[PDB]
Structure formats: structure tokens, C-alpha cells
Design a protein around this ligand. Structure first.
Ligand SMILES: [K+]
Ligand SMILES: [K+]
Ligand SMILES: [K+]
Ligand SMILES: [Mg+2]
Ligand SMILES: [Mg+2]
Ligand SMILES: [Mg+2]
Ligand SMILES: [Mg+2]
Ligand SMILES: [Mg+2]
Ligand SMILES: [Mg+2]
Ligand SMILES: [Mg+2]
Ligand SMILES: [Mg+2]
Ligand SMILES: [Mg+2]
Ligand SMILES: [Mg+2]
Ligand SMILES: [Mg+2]
Ligand SMILES: [Mg+2]
Ligand SMILES: [Zn+2]
Lengths: 174, 122, 38, 207
RNA sequence: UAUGUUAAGUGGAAAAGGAUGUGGGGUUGCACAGACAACUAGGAUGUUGGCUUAGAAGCAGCCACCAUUUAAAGAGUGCGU
RNA sequence: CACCUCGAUGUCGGCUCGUCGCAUCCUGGGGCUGUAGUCGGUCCCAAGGGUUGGGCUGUUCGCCCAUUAAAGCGGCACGCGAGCUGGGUUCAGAACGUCGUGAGACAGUUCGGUCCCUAUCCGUCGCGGGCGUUGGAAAUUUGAGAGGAGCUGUCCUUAGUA
RNA sequence: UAAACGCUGAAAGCAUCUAAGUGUGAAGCCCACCUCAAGAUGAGAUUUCCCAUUUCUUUAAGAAAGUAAGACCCCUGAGAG
């Protein structure tokens, strides 16, 4: 099997710009850029892109797959974006959004403030249902993890912040 | 400037008459105490028909000292003897009636019952 | 973490990974199966 | 930041809007004068050079008069630089009155300490005297110099020598009162120096 | 000079033992009537097989292991009640 | 084992001064828990600082008292006697027990008993003179680089909330 | 940065903190706080002052012999010693 040889659909509305390095991607949601290495060959069709490695070495197979994955991430983010849904649960826990500045009440004596960059949004459809939303999967996951690390889950009773849909094992404490 | 092996008179009717500082409390290497500082001590001379008796180990509070106390306004109190009051784990005393005077410095340290039971509080 | 040169898996769900040049065992089910070399 | 430099006078004992004493040191700050302004493009750093106490011209010298002549003032005795300050606020010839400070602000004070002379290790470093009885011949001495194996004495083994003359800061002091008519600052607490000695006052670095 | 190997400063310190480290060679299995891994649909019934125990009724202790459509299901992999 | 030291090798403990390592006693970080919470147990990282005063014994150790946030383990000629003490070490005296026919000895104990040295070199702490820094001088300075300091309890609140 | 926590992610269609990429993260490290410090012969930088004289010897970065700026001797002394 293989990933890197798998073609990559735009599908339409998305655009790109090759270069020696620092390839650029564009479309409805916005812009993105990233410095893929000059060891991969970038074949392009009107709707489909492919990456080819020079040989069958460890390193080049790795770079092949990684570049396909990152390029797919950039395209999918510019088309549909990404969003991580978090669910904070507890007796007296709640949250609220003020622009790019999230506030959190999670049991600590003081309310906690996180802040996003311009490329990321906090939604808060409900007091306990946070959603990070964005275009760079890396930054989205990083911010969601930093948030989760404020008051992470617990096994005995479940008090803490989660990813919506994950598994959180629990112990039958006395 | 009350140290280990320093002897003190007793300023209450708890039963004791003379005291000897075993150690000063507060920290690790405190080699000195003054008013408001708690003490661990023996009883070298007790009243005969007293509750507190010879040999007993007990906590105590320094209530008046020759090397006396200082106020913010430069007003300093000093005494002609070094005396202490025996207490329990709580700041309350063992006996019931304090003798002689007492410094005001104890009200900050929350020995309010001793401050009240004392006749004169300087 | 169980730091031991005799790192080896304890169940079927244990994966073995060389991470920062150290051998590690990672089980999502039982974190007591989490092991490292040292 | 900011600062001045002045002369120690002595100690006092002062009441502050209440009966609460505050011990105090007096600093006479006859108005300092800017003499030079240093910048990166000529000198390597932003700074301002300052003089405090007027000499007699017979005591001064030609190359010092030439350095003062720009500011159009008299030969100064003590000359120091102040760093980490605003240069657009200050100009050559500017006189720095004590009004610059506000009574209550926090402050840092440098000075040169009282010379105690050639002193032993006990007074110079707090080392402990040996026993004075029980056959002891070891009373005021600094002890062993170290182990055997190096065949040498390690450095910063503390010994007798000159105690005093060092430059010392005192931080987080407080300005109690200002008298611009008399050009005097009152500072809460002791500060390093003999009387008639130079002091540098500065706004606090920590605060 | 030529061919390769090593990615630890190994070289330039040392064992039992541990490891999808990497290179070479061989054997063997499966595989374009489609391998392996993933995703989707299903994963059951007479039957909650019985004994058991207040309760074990797929999985405390204890015997067997037929049958079903089948495209396939163990008289049940663990959790858990 | 007896390689160095018998034309000297000073023997334990304590004192003064400390310095180093980390196999970390406390503080600091974290994972696992048979971690409900407080306390914890264990392991990984971490040596920045700190790591008590007394009674008994010559004692190290150890026991005890009372505190501590904690009362670390070791090395540096079981650190340091041209820096101190000399209590303990059977130097010479004497005595008990025991042994010896005995002079004497310890398979044991006890009382008492001279600790010399003006620092040459390196080394260390401080202070100077000379010269240099490329004309001579007076001041202020960047700062390579070095050192010093680095600790911590209790209470209140959050809250008798989780 | 340590240990630990990872985000994205491939080798290995999944998975995975790592291989590239990226980030939290300790009383510890480099700074930040204080002091010494240009003998730092790698001898630094800035401001200001004195000026470019006489003879002899020589094409000599020459020698002595009076001086400028300035410093010192010497004396009265302590905030120093
Ligand atoms: K040597
Ligand atoms: K010998
Ligand atoms: K010696
Ligand atoms: Mg004497
Ligand atoms: Mg000899
Ligand atoms: Mg360690
Ligand atoms: Mg003692
Ligand atoms: Mg006694
Ligand atoms: Mg020794
Ligand atoms: Mg003796
Ligand atoms: Mg004899
Ligand atoms: Mg006989
Ligand atoms: Mg005698
Ligand atoms: Mg000597
Ligand atoms: Mg960081
Ligand atoms: Zn496992």
C-alpha cells in the first residue's frame, strides 16, 4: 500500500502556487503556505495533484507521505476548514467567548483566559460546549490541547474538559 | 532574649512557680524569644497543691521581659523580671488568674483571654 | 511510567515505539502497561 | 528611569502624619547639572553624564573646565553617568532639582561604605571565634585553608584584609519628604557611606 | 583510489537482558477468481444451552458444544450489569 | 596483595573553615496507583539553596527529650594537629580481678600523666611600585569574563467550596 | 531545556509526540538583581586640555635639554589608613 501516490483533489475554487520552495495554497476560507522540500516532484493536473519521490529509500518514502498529507491538510482546510469540539463538564463549570478571547470557569479560584490568533475562532454555542474552528489543523489542535490542559478529565467522576467524542476511562473510586 | 535553659517566673495560678525554657518555637534555629513567642518548658518549682507539678513538660507564653518590647511610635516597654504564662495547645491558659502586668503586644498574637484576665495591660 | 531495561509488551494492545531514541511501550487501555528504558 | 546624586549628611528621627516614627537619612542634593549626553551612534549606549558639587577653580583643571564649559556651569567635584533614562527629556545645561522625586516613591541608593581597615575574617565575614578556654589556643583565626589533595588553597577562601570602601546598593527604600528650598531628600532608613560622602539616588529597578 | 556499512561522537568503556534501529542472505505463508491494514453492513438464533447462586441469563465456580440462514457468527473475546 | 612510606607515618573523636558528588532529606516538576479528598506509596528529572539545639558516653554510631519544611548518604590522607584541643589511646607511677613458681602480663577495668617550629617558594586574602597599552595628560565609561545571592514556614482568603 | 504533555504527521493506507515541521514545560541552565572588571598585551570607546620648541647628529620611529597641559615631591589632616 501507499499514501503519497494517492492523487489529491482540489476540487474547485481552490488554487495553488508552485515555487522552488514555500508552496502556497488559496481558496474560499483563506491563504496558506508551507515549505515542502525540494526532493519531491510535484506533478499537477487541473483538478488533481500528485507527489513523486526520487527513489524507494526510507527517507524519501517518509517525505513523500508527509508532503501528501500536509498538502491534503492545506487543501481541506482552505475548502471546509477544521474544528475541534470540546465539552467541559462539572458542577459549576461554564464558559463564554468574547471575540478572540475565551473565558473559562472550571473550578479554579480565578477564571482562566485563553486567546486565539486571527486565523482561529472560538464559537461557544453553549456554556459547556466549546468549539475551536480554523484553517490550520496544527494550530487548531495546539489550541484545543492547551485548553484541555487547563482542567483535563478525571477517572473518578469525570470533571474536566474533553474532546467531543473521545473516550475517557473511569475508575470506581470509593 | 529568652533562651534555652533560661528560667522564668510564672504569671498565673496554674500551679507552677518557676519554669525553664526547653526550646523556643517558630522556625528551625530560633535561639531567642521575646513577648508573644511561645515556649516549651519544664516546671522546676510548683505550688504544692497545684495542678501543674514538678517535672511536667508544658507549653508557655512569654508575657513580660526585661529585654522588652517596642512600639511603632518609638515607645518601648521594659520590665524588672522575665515571666511567662502556661497554656494548652489552644492559646488559652491552664490556670485562671494572671498576676502582675502584661504587654499590649499579645493582642496582635491573639492571646486575648490572657489580655483580659490580666489586671493591667501596658 | 515503568522505567526498566526489560521493556516488553504486557498485552495485545501494547505498541512499541522508538521515541527520542528511547524504546517505549504504549497501551491506551491500561496505562500501567506504559514502559520506558532507563 | 531617573535619579540624582547627592551628599550624605546624617540621621534623624521623624514622625509621618501619625505618631509612627520613621528613622531617616538626610541627602543634600544641591542641584545636579547635566554635562554630556551619550548615544549609541557616537558612544555605544544611551546615557547622561551629571555633576553635583562645585569645586573651586584653583582645585579644578583646564581639561575639566573645558568639559563643563558647554553646559555653562562651574567645575564639579563628583561626576557620574545615569543609564536607562529618557534622553529627549534631558538636555545639556539642565539642572536636576529634587522636585523630580515624589515623597513616598520607591528608590534605590548606591554609596561607598565606611572604611573599616585591615580587619580579620571574623569581623569581615562573620566567621566564628574559637573557644576561649578549655586549653584553646585558637581564638580569632579563620581555620583550615582546605584539604590536602589539591596541595593548594581554593579561591574565595575568606581571610583578613581591607573591610570597607566597597560600592553598595540598598534597594526598595522610600522617600519620606522633599525640601526643594533646602535641596534635601529624607530617605527611610540607613544607607551606605560616611558623612560628606557621595550617594546616587535612582528610581527602583525592581519596582 | 575503489566499493559498501554505521548516525551513536559509536569509533573514543562494561555485562545479563530488551527492542517494527538499519544493511545483507536464505526459508516460509498469503496475494490481482483482489493479499494485509483500514472503512461500511452484519456479528445472531431454538437459547436468557443447562448446573450454579437472591442473582451468572454469552463472560463468578461447573458440563457440553448441536443447530440456523449462510455471505457469517464461539452454545460466546473481554469490559460491565 | 604487600607496590610507596621505618635517615618518622600523627592515632580516634570534637572545634574553625569549608568544598565536591548525586544513589535527592525538604523545597521544585511529572507519570503510575490497590490515587475518592487530606495524607500518601513508588518511579523519572532536578544538586540552586537549606538540612536544629540539648542529656548519656572520650566516643563515631546509638538511645532519649524537644523542635523542624527537612533533621540526607558519602568523598576530599575515615578533609583539615607548621590551624586548636588531647577526653580516648596500657610511655614511664599505682591499684582491683584473673593468669603465671616468678620477673611480669591482659583474655578486662581504674586514678594520674611535656602536643616543638621567627613561613623561603607555591597557594590564598588584600594593598602598592614599575612598565606597557605607539605624542603627553585629566575624567567618565561599554563590557568580554569572573564572583556573590539563590532558602523557607505559618496565617487569611478563594472556602467549609470541590 | 530536563523528565513529562503533546499538535500535525509518515515510514507501516490505520496507529503513533518525531523522522522532517511545531509547541507547552522545573527551586535547575543563559539573562534578569548586586559587586569586581580594558594587564580583555585581543590593553577598547567617548569628552576635554597641551601643543608640533632649541641644539647636535642625519636621513636616524635618532640623541640631549629646557618646557606646555598635568602630575609628583614637601607640608596641614581625616570621611582614609
Ligand atoms: K598539583
Ligand atoms: K615509616
Ligand atoms: K596539615
Ligand atoms: Mg590564650
Ligand atoms: Mg626524610
Ligand atoms: Mg537522580
Ligand atoms: Mg554540646
Ligand atoms: Mg547537668
Ligand atoms: Mg582524618
Ligand atoms: Mg589522657
Ligand atoms: Mg606500670
Ligand atoms: Mg598466684
Ligand atoms: Mg594532677
Ligand atoms: Mg604563623
Ligand atoms: Mg518554553
Ligand atoms: Zn497494553
Amino acid at each position: 500500500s501507499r499514501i503519497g501516490n494517492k492523487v489529491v483533489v482540489l476540487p474547485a475554487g481552490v488554487e495553488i502556487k508552485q515555487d522552488g520552495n514555500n508552496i502556497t495554497v488559496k481558496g474560499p476560507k483563506g491563504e496558506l503556505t508551507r515549505e515542502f522540500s525540494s526532493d519531491i516532484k510535484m506533478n499537477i493536473e487541473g483538478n488533481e495533484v500528485t507527489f513523486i519521490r526520487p527513489n524507494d529509500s526510507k527517507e524519501m518514502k517518509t517525505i513523500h507521505g508527509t508532503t501528501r498529507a500536509n498538502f491534503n491538510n492545506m487543501v481541506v482546510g482552505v475548502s471546509e476548514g477544521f474544528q475541534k469540539a470540546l465539552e467541559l463538564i462539572g458542577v459549576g463549570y461554564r464558559a463564554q467567548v468574547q471575540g478572540n478571547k475565551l473565558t473559562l470557569n472550571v473550578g479554579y479560584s480565578h477564571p482562566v483566559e485563553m486567546t486565539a490568533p486571527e486565523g482561529v475562532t472560538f464559537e461557544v454555542p453553549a456554556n459547556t460546549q466549546v468549539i475551536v474552528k480554523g484553517i490550520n489543523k496544527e494550530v487548531v489542535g495546539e489550541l484545543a490541547a492547551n485548553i484541555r490542559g487547563v482542567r483535563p478529565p478525571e477517572p473518578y467522576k469525570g470533571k474536566g474538559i474533553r474532546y467531543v467524542g473521545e473516550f475517557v476511562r473511569r475508575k470506581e473510586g470509593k | 532574649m529568652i533562651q534555652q535553659e533560661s528560667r522564668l517566673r510564672v504569671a498565673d495560678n496554674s500551679g507552677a512557680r518557676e519554669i525553664l525554657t526547653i526550646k523556643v518555637l517558630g522556625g528551625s534555629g530560633r535561639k531567642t524569644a521575646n513577648i508573644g513567642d511561645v515556649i516549651v518548658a519544664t516546671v522546676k518549682q510548683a505550688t504544692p497543691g497545684g495542678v501543674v507539678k514538678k517535672g511536667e513538660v508544658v507549653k508557655a507564653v512569654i508575657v513580660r521581659t526585661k529585654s522588652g518590647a517596642r512600639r511603632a511610635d518609638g515607645s518601648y516597654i521594659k520590665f524588672d523580671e522575665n515571666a511567662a504564662v502556661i497554656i494548652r495547645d489552644d492559646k488559652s491558659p491552664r490556670g485562671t488568674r494572671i498576676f502582675g502586668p502584661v504587654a499590649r503586644e499579645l493582642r496582635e498574637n491573639n492571646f486575648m483571654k490572657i489580655v483580659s484576665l490580666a489586671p493591667e495591660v501596658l | 511510567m515503568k522505567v526498566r531495561p526489560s521493556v516488553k509488551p504486557m498485552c495485545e494492545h501494547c505498541k512499541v515505539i522508538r521515541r527520542k531514541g528511547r524504546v517505549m511501550v504504549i497501551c491506551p487501555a491500561n496505562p500501567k502497561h506504559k514502559q520506558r528504558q532507563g | 528611569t531617573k535619579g540624582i546624586l547627592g551628599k550624605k549628611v546624617g540621621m534623624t528621627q521623624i514622625f509621618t502624619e501619625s505618631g509612627e516614627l520613621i528613622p531617616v537619612t538626610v541627602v543634600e542634593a544641591t542641584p545636579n547639572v547635566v554635562l554630556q549626553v551619550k548615544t549609541v551612534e557616537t558612544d555605544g549606549y544611551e546615557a547622561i553624564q551629571v555633576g553635583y558639587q562645585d569645586k573651586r577653580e584653583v582645585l579644578s583643571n583646564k581639561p575639566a573646565k573645558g568639559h563643563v564649559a558647554k553646559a555653562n556651569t562651574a567645575p564639579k567635584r563628583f561626576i557620574k553617568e545615569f543609564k536607562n533614562v529618557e534622553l529627549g527629556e534631558y538636555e545639556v545645561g539642565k539642572e536636576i532639582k529634587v522636585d523630580v522625586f515624589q515623597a513616598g516613591d520607591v528608590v534605590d541608593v548606591t554609596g561607598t561604605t565606611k572604611g573599616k581597615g585591615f580587619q580579620g575574617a571574623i569581623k569581615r565575614h562573620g566567621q566564628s571565634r574559637g573557644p576561649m578556654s578549655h586549653g584553646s589556643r585558637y581564638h580569632r583565626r579563620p581555620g583550615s585553608m582546605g584539604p590536602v589533595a589539591p596541595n593548594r588553597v581554593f579561591k574565595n577562601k575568606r581571610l583578613a584584609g581591607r573591610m570597607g570602601g566597597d560600592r553598595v546598593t540598598i534597594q526598595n527604600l522610600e522617600v519620606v519628604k522633599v525640601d526643594v528650598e533646602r535641596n534635601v531628600i529624607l530617605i527611610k532608613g540607613n544607607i551606605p557611606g560616611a558623612k560628606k560622602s557621595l550617594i546616587t539616588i535612582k528610581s527602583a529597578v525592581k519596582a
